């Protein structure tokens, strides 16, 4: 239970102490944080991702800061640093002075217009990228893989992750938003070539579906996805009593297998040689498949068939009556059982609801595969964000100072009370030019004022400090891209978040 | 709880030296063997930079990372773990001084890059191509053996080292995974490091010395049952009906006497003579009555020579693994010109040797089988990994710190870029390079600068690769001496340094993670 | 696994050996003081000599045990 | 070191300090021992026999210490006892006194990479000329005073006065019944403890001598199939007394029926196992006793493992429990088996005589074991020193009379060589005086007095001290031309082995 400044200064004691090493942990020159595990261990993290998990809670507001780092991790997976940075970077200056001006409130609506002038600043500096050209994305998409940096597959997996969210973009809500990712999924492939780590349609099933008898391939015959009751039903659609008598025993087995029959009267008509039964899978049920010349598929689940629903594009059958093709194994279908390494890979290509496409990732080993798998992430995430938002914006102090004086100019434009948060929020922008230089080792001061001067001339339009060169430069020059996607999404979060814990003047039970 | 900035940074450079302070006493022939009765709780002895770490149970977090990076090195190398650990904290000293004079760890590491390059480039610039020859290989052998052990016992280990390296070259393997075989032997003296052109087998038999001397081997390495069992089991265990157990017990013995009489058929088919031995080797045990039936006929039936044997037997001897006796030819088995069942100490060690197409030529080490015999068991293996690299590379530079007065002094002469942004990491880098040449030189009671200035200038003057005499701490010429650094060895320890030296430099804060 | 070396243990041996003689100092001609000795067993313990109480007394000392056994010898 | 974590019992200071310190302090025994001494150690492993000892091996058997060297180093000292029985009370003090010689050089700052070398180098220089200072040899091993002379350093080293008859008794034992051709056996010739008689009465009765009682008869034939059984007779089903008078007059019989007719078939199949002697690890029942005599089977009423072990060893026996008709996997070894009265005690005597496998057995007669063990200890370390398996012992000057001989060898050779090892070698020329002091200590003078007057004898070979008045003021007992002599074997070892210990123990920092 906290109140007043004890919340507010405690809110400062929440995110900032989180965001302290994080700025060293952030930027392209990011300096990892050392951690000390409860075992006596160590974890070296540039992440705002891993720190909050391990580090124990230092303040109730931090538990709220953790989730907005989650929310940004949920939204992207990067910017988790900045959201707790930016919001916590807002908490230190404005509130207490403005509680001395007596308000959480004027700061909120200030934060809201501290939000918009950036959103006002962005549309110029955040300028449309062409999602058509891969390299026009790949410059953003190399900007995604360049900091986290697994360099070998930061090359190919991008073009893969480019194609990943591209091939998983049909996305139809009617508004053509592209959040669409899940269709794009990695594939854990033993052995094989380090290349042919690539995007294929549907979902080739690497999870639970690996069998000596699928035959070795089922191409034209269907993969049949059963939610439904492949096991017998003793009545019509239903079940009746067991055997206490000679009379009851013969009566039971008729409708039992007849249900399996009347299932596989309507199940066999659609031509599987592989029926994947996630539920209703049982010995006699799969033994029937064994006896039906249709592969008995066990140790398989909803994700599988939901991935197979995402693979051939099937709809996992919710009707015990009348199974068909477009139910399960849509199209002529391809179920391709390939051992690259010793795992049978269920390859189900030929996706219906097309543009739902996984990513076949093949290393010579899981690491060199996971090296594709991790580089894929930031790429495809930012690809998703670039395909979502077809814009890019210069990184570093460019967005920082162009909005900084803007908010400052806006603060002077207002010359009111809320100016003071604008005064506080504009500086929140500039800790990043600090952060970028607070990495490289020069004096950000000389450059801050010079980046002020970079605004004095150029309004820091495209000109930020680039963390790894530690100098104040055009990012359209350097091709360093935060998108209006990645940033505004990150900036949007913290804007709410600082308000949130500032909307807390009292913590209670 | 947290430690901010320099605090977590102080923890970095703090733990690093005691490591090296072991190494200043652990490095080279100048270094000293370290008995650890504490480390794992075991009673131990070791010289190496990598091994002393893992032997300890280490409670310090900075040192939890430390046993990691020399591991992959000692895998390749066997030396330089006794060294790389030195350069890291010696680098952590500099890097500390520069943040002590103030700096970020980033603008520190920035100067490592070109400095690391120019030195890694100097690896190329110096690299001495040494035609890889048992003589030169003896030197690369003993230098790692001298590093870890007596130059005396180095040359004792060196032979069996340089023995099986040409013998693994005989297997067309530039690395060595086989004839890496180091066989402890029960003896009053560890002084004996020998070579067996074939295996050292485990159990001649529980009925011993069947045919103890086999000078022509027909080797059947068989996981079969001449011991199936003689004891009381029903389904293979104790069932609930006691009378039903011994019913199958005879057929268990009879299925042995199936395989036994098959050998009477087999030894006949194979040999027909005790002259050229048919050799049963069982991955399981063997009944003494199987042995008795076989031994009196001039057969040696070995039991429980391990799966490594079952391979190396099937391998080194040109042998086979045939899991049914039945009837087989001598050529259905491999051949070894000597199989001798040999007792020094308790166990009789059957030596299957002169093995045709040897895939394993065993390196015999006699001794008390203590940490002592292990102390000569690791250095050889470590020295093996060194000459393994010496087989791997065709280029081996001198040892004895001869490289850095050629390497560091050049980087001491010049920033690789000749600009100050490098100097911040070049001063740190080029400095840390000279620890190994200076440490044992100063460990010998010879001041580093006066010792270095010679070996430095003696390189500057003569263009010489100029070593240190590790025991006398004097400038030597390691190009001729034979203390020689594999291009494979020296390269990774640079990386192993750099890879572990950056993030820990770049981590200024530590906190309890749970 | 305990030892005391040198004179310190040596001299320490005598008194443990001597104190029992300080009892028997003259127990042959009996006159002196005789205390009825009740051990931890509830056993009232006396003697016509030194040996029987010596039989009753035990020590962790080898020394004080020797001359005991010797006087018993 | 700089860490809260990791591990060590040694290092830094400690390696220079604790690793040298207590390893020396171990020597206090060997500092008072090895050569004639009345000084002894009461060591109580709590056996209810409070054990007098000067023997380092069974002194160090109890001693346990965290010092990894002193933890280890007892190994080389016990590895010594394996190789020679005498010279072991020499091992611990010599290096132990030779240790802190280097530590003083460590105070001078003379390196561990340096000093021990000179020792090792003079360890060579010793073992270089150490065979040159060999003088005599123990040649005829049937002969008493060629054997008892080697014995006359060795038991003497352990203990002083008793030595002489022991040496005779041990040479009169004829451990040469083992031709010593490469043959010696510690179990076949064995010590057999007999309470009472004299220790001068302590004898050697050839065969296997068991103070355990031969029960009933003796063997049917002297080449027995020897029945060595842990529990052949425990009783079958025992009798009872219920009322503190009788249980029932009726219930008495049926248990003897089970007892007898089993122990009938038992001992009848002790006769059907062909046992000429049945050797019972447990007790005997009078019925089986009666059966053992009728079936004509020598009976041993009780057997300690001391029997059963050597029985398993010599006879090829396996001591077995029997409630059942037996079978002999024991058989015999023995060509002779007896009840003899030895120690004037009725004794189970298994016997034969050969060169190899031959049992020719010491029988020790003493009022206690502390008598018959530490003396045996003193005894057997000469018997152990008799074990060379180079028949000629290459007898050096005994009583450590070669100290002064090598002392001026090493100190002159320490003068030759330059560099810090010249000190270490001259330091190696020092620790010689330890046993001469260890003697002069139990004798009561400083080795200086001794050794300086034996620096006046220069090359001598004969004169060296001990426990005696000659060892105090005169600084002289004649230990080469003596009757008191020692083999070169233990000379080859102790100087090298105590060094082998002292080699790396300063090197070990962790």
């Amino acid at each position: 239970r906290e109140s007043g400044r004890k919340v507010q200064s405690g809110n400062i004691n929440a995110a900032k102490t989180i965001a302290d090493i994080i700025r060293t942990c952030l930027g392209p020159k990011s300096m990892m944080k050392m951690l000390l595990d409860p075992m006596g261990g160590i974890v070296m993290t540039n992440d705002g991702n891993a720190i909050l998990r391990e580090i124990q809670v230092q303040h109730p507001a931090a538990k709220s800061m953790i989730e907005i780092s989650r929310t940004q991790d949920e939204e992207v997976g990067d910017g988790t640093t900045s959201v707790i940075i930016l919001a916590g970077e807002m908490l230190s200056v404005a509130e207490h002075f403005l509680e001395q001006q007596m308000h959480p409130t004027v700061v909120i609506s200030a934060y809201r217009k501290a939000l918009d002038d950036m959103i006002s600043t962005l549309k110029k500096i955040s300028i449309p990228v062409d999602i058509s050209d891969s390299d026009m994305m790949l410059n953003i998409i190399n900007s995604s893989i360049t900091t986290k940096a697994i360099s070998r597959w930061s090359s190919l997996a991008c073009n893969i992750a480019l194609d990943a969210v591209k091939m998983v973009q049909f996305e139809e809500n009617g508004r053509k938003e592209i959040d669409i990712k899940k269709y794009a999924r990695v594939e854990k492939i033993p052995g094989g070539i380090i290349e042919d780590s690539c995007v294929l349609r549907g979902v080739m099933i690497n999870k639970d579906v690996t069998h000596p008898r699928m035959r070795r391939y089922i191409k034209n015959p269907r993969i049949v996805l059963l939610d439904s009751s492949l096991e017998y039903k003793k009545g019509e659609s239903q079940t009746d009593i067991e055997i206490t008598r000679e009379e009851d025993f013969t009566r039971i087995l008729q409708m039992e297998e007849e249900y399996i029959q009347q299932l596989c009267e309507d199940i066999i008509q659609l031509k599987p040689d592989v029926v994947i039964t996630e539920k209703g899978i049982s010995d006699l049920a799969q033994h029937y498949l064994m006896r039906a010349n249709i592969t008995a598929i066990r140790r398989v689940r909803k994700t599988d068939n939901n991935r197979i629903a995402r693979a051939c594009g099937a709809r996992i059958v919710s009707r015990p009556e009348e199974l068909r093709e477009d139910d399960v194994g849509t199209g002529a279908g391809l179920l391709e059982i390939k051992k690259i390494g010793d795992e049978y890979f269920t390859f189900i290509t030929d996706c219906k609801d097309p543009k739902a496409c996984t990513i076949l990732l093949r290393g010579a080993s899981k690491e060199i595969l996971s090296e594709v798998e991790r580089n894929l992430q930031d790429a495809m995430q930012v690809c998703r964000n670039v395909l979502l938002d077809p814009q890019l914006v210069p990184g570093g102090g460019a967005s920082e100072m162009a909005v900084a004086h803007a908010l400052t100019e806006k603060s002077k434009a207002m010359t009111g009370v809320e100016q003071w948060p604008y005064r506080a929020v504009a500086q929140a922008l500039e800790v990043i030019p600090r952060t970028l230089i607070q990495n490289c080792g020069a004096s950000t001061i000389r450059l801050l004022t010079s980046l002020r001067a970079k605004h004095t001339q150029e309004n820091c339009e495209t000109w930020g400090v680039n963390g790894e060169t530690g100098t104040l430069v055009d990012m359209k020059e350097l091709g360093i891209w935060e998108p209006l996607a990645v940033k505004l999404q990150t900036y949007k979060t913290a804007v709410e978040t600082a308000v949130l814990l500032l909307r807390i003047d009292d913590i209670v039970s | 709880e947290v430690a901010r900035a320099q605090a977590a940074l102080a923890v970095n450079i703090s733990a690093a030296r005691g490591l090296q302070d072991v190494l200043r006493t652990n490095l080279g022939p100048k270094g000293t063997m370290k008995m650890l009765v504490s480390g794992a709780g075991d009673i131990k002895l070791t010289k190496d930079g990598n091994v002393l770490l893992h032997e300890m149970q280490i409670q310090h977090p900075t040192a939890s990372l430390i046993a990691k990076v020399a591991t992959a090195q000692d895998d390749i190398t066997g030396d330089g773990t006794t060294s790389n650990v030195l350069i890291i904290g010696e680098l952590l000293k500099q890097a500390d001084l520069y943040i002590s004079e103030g700096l970020h760890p980033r603008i520190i590491t920035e100067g490592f890059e070109a400095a690391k390059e120019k030195a890694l480039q100097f690896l190329e610039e110096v690299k001495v191509s040494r035609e890889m020859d048992r003589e030169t290989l003896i030197d690369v052998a003993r230098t790692s053996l001298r590093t870890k052990v007596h130059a005396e016992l180095a040359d004792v280990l060196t032979e069996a080292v340089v023995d099986s390296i040409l013998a693994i070259k005989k297997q067309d393997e530039p690395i060595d995974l086989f004839m890496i075989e180091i066989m402890e032997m029960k003896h009053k003296s560890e002084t004996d490091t020998s070579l067996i052109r074939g295996l050292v087998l485990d159990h001649g038999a529980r009925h011993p010395d069947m045919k103890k001397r086999v000078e022509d081997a027909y080797i059947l390495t068989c996981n079969v049952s001449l011991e199936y069992e003689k004891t009381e089991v029903n389904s293979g265990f104790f069932y609930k009906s006691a009378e039903e157990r011994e019913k199958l017990v005879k057929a268990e013995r009879k299925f042995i006497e199936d395989r036994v009489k098959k050998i009477i058929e087999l030894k006949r088919k194979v040999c027909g003579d005790s002259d050229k031995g048919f050799v049963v080797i069982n991955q399981k045990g063997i009944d003494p009555f199987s042995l008795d039936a076989l031994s009196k006929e001039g057969i040696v039936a070995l039991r429980r020579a391990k799966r490594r044997n079952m391979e190396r037997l099937t391998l080194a001897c040109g042998g086979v693994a045939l899991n049914s006796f039945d009837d087989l030819s001598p050529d259905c088995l491999g051949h070894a010109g000597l199989v001798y069942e040999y007792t020094l100490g308790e166990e009789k060690f059957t030596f299957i040797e002169k093995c045709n197409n040897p895939r394993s030529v065993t390196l015999l080490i006699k001794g008390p089988n203590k940490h002592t015999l292990t102390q000569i068991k690791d250095a050889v293996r470590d020295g093996l990994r060194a000459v393994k690299n010496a087989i791997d590379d065709g280029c081996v530079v001198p040892g004895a710190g001869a490289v850095e007065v050629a390497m560091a002094e050049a980087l001491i002469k010049h920033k690789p870029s000749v600009k100050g942004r490098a100097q911040l990491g070049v001063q740190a880098f080029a400095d840390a390079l000279l620890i190994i040449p200076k440490v044992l030189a100063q460990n010998s009671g010879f001041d580093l600068q006066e010792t270095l200035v010679k070996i430095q200038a003696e390189h500057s003057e003569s263009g010489q690769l100029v070593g240190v005499d590790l025991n006398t701490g004097e400038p030597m010429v390691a190009a001729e001496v034979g203390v020689w650094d594999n291009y494979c060895v020296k390269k990774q320890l640079l990386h192993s340094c750099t890879v572990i030296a950056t993030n820990i430099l770049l981590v200024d804060e530590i906190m309890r993670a749970g | 696994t305990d030892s005391s070396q040198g004179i310190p243990q040596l001299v320490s041996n005598i008194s443990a050996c001597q104190v029992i003689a300080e009892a028997v100092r003259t127990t042959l001609g009996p006159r002196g003081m005789d205390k009825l000795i009740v051990d931890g067993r509830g056993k009232a313990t006396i003697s016509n000599d030194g040996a029987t109480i010596l039989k009753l007394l035990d020590v962790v000392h080898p020394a004080a045990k020797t001359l005991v056994d010797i006087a018993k010898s | 070191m700089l860490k809260e974590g990791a591990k060590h019992f040694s290092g830094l200071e400690e390696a220079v300090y604790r690793n040298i310190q207590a390893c020396k302090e171990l020597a206090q025994t060997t500092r008072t021992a090895y050569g004639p001494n009345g000084m002894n150690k009461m060591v109580i492993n709590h056996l209810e026999k409070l054990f007098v000892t000067n023997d380092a091996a069974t002194i160090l058997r109890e001693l346990e210490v965290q010092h990894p060297a002193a933890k280890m180093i007892v190994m080389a000292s016990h590895m010594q006892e394996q190789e020679v029985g005498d010279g072991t009370n020499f091992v611990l003090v010599f290096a132990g006194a030779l240790l802190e010689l280097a530590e003083e050089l460590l105070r001078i700052g003379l390196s561990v990479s340096e000093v021990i070398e000179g020792y090792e180098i003079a360890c060579r220089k010793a073992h270089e000329i150490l065979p040159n200072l060999v003088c005599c040899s123990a040649k005829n091993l049937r002969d008493i005073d060629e054997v008892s002379s080697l014995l006359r350093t060795s038991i003497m080293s352990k203990q002083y006065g008793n030595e002489v008859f022991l040496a005779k008794l041990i040479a009169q034992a004829c451990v040469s019944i083992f031709p010593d051709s490469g043959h010696f056996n510690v179990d076949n010739i064995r010590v057999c403890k007999i309470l009472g008689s004299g220790i001068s009465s302590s004898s050697v009765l050839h065969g296997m001598v068991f103070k355990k009682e031969t029960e009933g008869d003796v063997t049917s034939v002297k080449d027995a199939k020897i029945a060595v059984y842990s529990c052949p007779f425990d009783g079958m089903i025992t009798e009872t007394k219920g009322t503190v008078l009788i249980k029932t007059a009726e219930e008495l019989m049926n248990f003897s029926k089970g007892e007898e007719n089993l122990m009938d078939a038992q001992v009848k199949a002790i006769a059907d196992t062909g046992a000429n002697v049945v050797v019972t690890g447990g007790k005997v029942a009078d019925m089986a006793l009666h059966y053992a005599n009728k079936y004509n089977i020598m009976l041993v009423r009780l057997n300690s493992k001391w029997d059963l072990r050597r029985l398993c060893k010599t006879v090829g026996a396996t001591a077995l429990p029997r409630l059942t008709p037996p079978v002999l996997e024991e058989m015999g070894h023995c060509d002779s088996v007896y009840l003899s009265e030895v120690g004037d005690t009725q004794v189970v005597v298994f016997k034969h005589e050969k060169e190899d496998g031959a049992i020719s057995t010491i029988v020790l007669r003493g009022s206690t074991d502390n008598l018959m063990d530490d003396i045996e200890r003193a005894v057997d370390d000469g018997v152990n020193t008799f074990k060379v398996l180079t028949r000629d012992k290459r007898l050096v000057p005994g009583g450590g009379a070669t100290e002064i001989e090598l002392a001026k060898q090493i100190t002159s050779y320490g003068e030759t060589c330059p560099g810090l090892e010249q000190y270490a070698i001259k330091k190696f020329a020092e620790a010689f005086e330890a046993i001469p002091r260890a003697l002069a200590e139990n004798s009561g003078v400083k080795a200086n007095e001794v050794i300086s007057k034996l620096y006046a004898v220069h090359q001598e070979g004969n004169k060296n001290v001990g426990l005696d008045i000659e060892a105090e003021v005169p600084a002289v007992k004649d230990m080469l031309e003596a009757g008191i002599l020692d083999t070169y074997l233990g000379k080859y070892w102790a100087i090298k082995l105590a060094t082998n210990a002292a080699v790396t123990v300063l090197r070990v920092d962790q």
Side-chain angles (χ1 to χ4, degrees), chain C residues 1 5 60-62 65, chain D residues 28 42 44 50 62-63:
Chain C
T1 304
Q5 295 180 336
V60 296
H61 303 291
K65 184 62 173 174
Chain D
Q28 292 294 103
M42 301 296 293
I44 301 171
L50 309 173
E62 299 302 320
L63 299 177

Side-chain angles (χ1 to χ4, degrees), chain A residues 183-245:
Chain A
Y183 302 155
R185 179 185 178 175
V186 301
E187 296 302 323
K188 296 183 182 299
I189 301 318
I193 179 59
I194 66 158
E195 291 182 351
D196 189 64
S197 294
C198 52
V199 290
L200 277 63
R201 293 180 62 185
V203 184
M204 67 208 90
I205 309 296
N206 60 345
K207 295 179 67 66
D208 296 342
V209 191
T210 291
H211 291 157
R213 177 186 176 90
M214 292 182 75
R215 307 290 183 271
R216 294 292 179 270
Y217 301 94
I218 300 304
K219 293 289 188 291
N220 194 29
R222 302 289 175 266
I223 182 53
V224 170
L225 292 65
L226 288 171
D227 278 342
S228 300
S229 180
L230 182 64
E231 187 177 2
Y232 53 86
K233 294 289 183 290
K234 297 182 176 72
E236 307 301 319
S237 178
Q238 63 282 1
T239 298
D240 285 344
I241 62 177
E242 62 184 343
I243 300 100
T244 187
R245 292 174 61 187

Side-chain angles (χ1 to χ4, degrees), chain B residues 14-15 17-18 21-22 25 30-39 43 52 56-59 63 188 370-371 471, chain D residues 1-10 66 68 71-72 75 79 82-83 111-114 503-504 507-510:
Chain B
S14 65
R17 313 294 186 269
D21 294 344
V22 169
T25 59
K30 181 57 170 61
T32 55
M33 289 177 180
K34 308 297 180 65
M35 282 177 68
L36 284 65
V37 297
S38 64
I43 311 304
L52 291 174
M56 298 181 288
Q57 296 296 100
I58 304 168
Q59 300 80 357
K188 295 299 290 184
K370 292 163 59 181
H371 60 76
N471 291 336
Chain D
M1 292 177 179
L2 299 178
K3 294 179 291 183
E4 296 177 353
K7 297 295 286 185
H8 63 79
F9 282 91
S10 65
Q66 293 179 336
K71 187 180 293 179
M72 178 171 175
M75 294 175 182
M79 177 174 172
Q82 305 170 340
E83 299 166 349
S111 296
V112 57
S113 64
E114 293 301 318
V503 169
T504 307
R507 291 175 67 87
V508 295
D509 296 344
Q510 198 174 355

Side-chain angles (χ1 to χ4, degrees), chain B residues 83 180 188 206 445 481 508:
Chain B
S83 297
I180 62 160
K188 295 299 290 184
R206 57 175 59 88
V481 167
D508 300 349

Side-chain angles (χ1 to χ4, degrees), chain B residues 34-50:
Chain B
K34 308 297 180 65
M35 282 177 68
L36 284 65
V37 297
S38 64
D42 293 343
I43 311 304
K44 295 176 292 296
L45 175 64
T46 296
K47 278 178 63 63
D48 178 59
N50 196 40

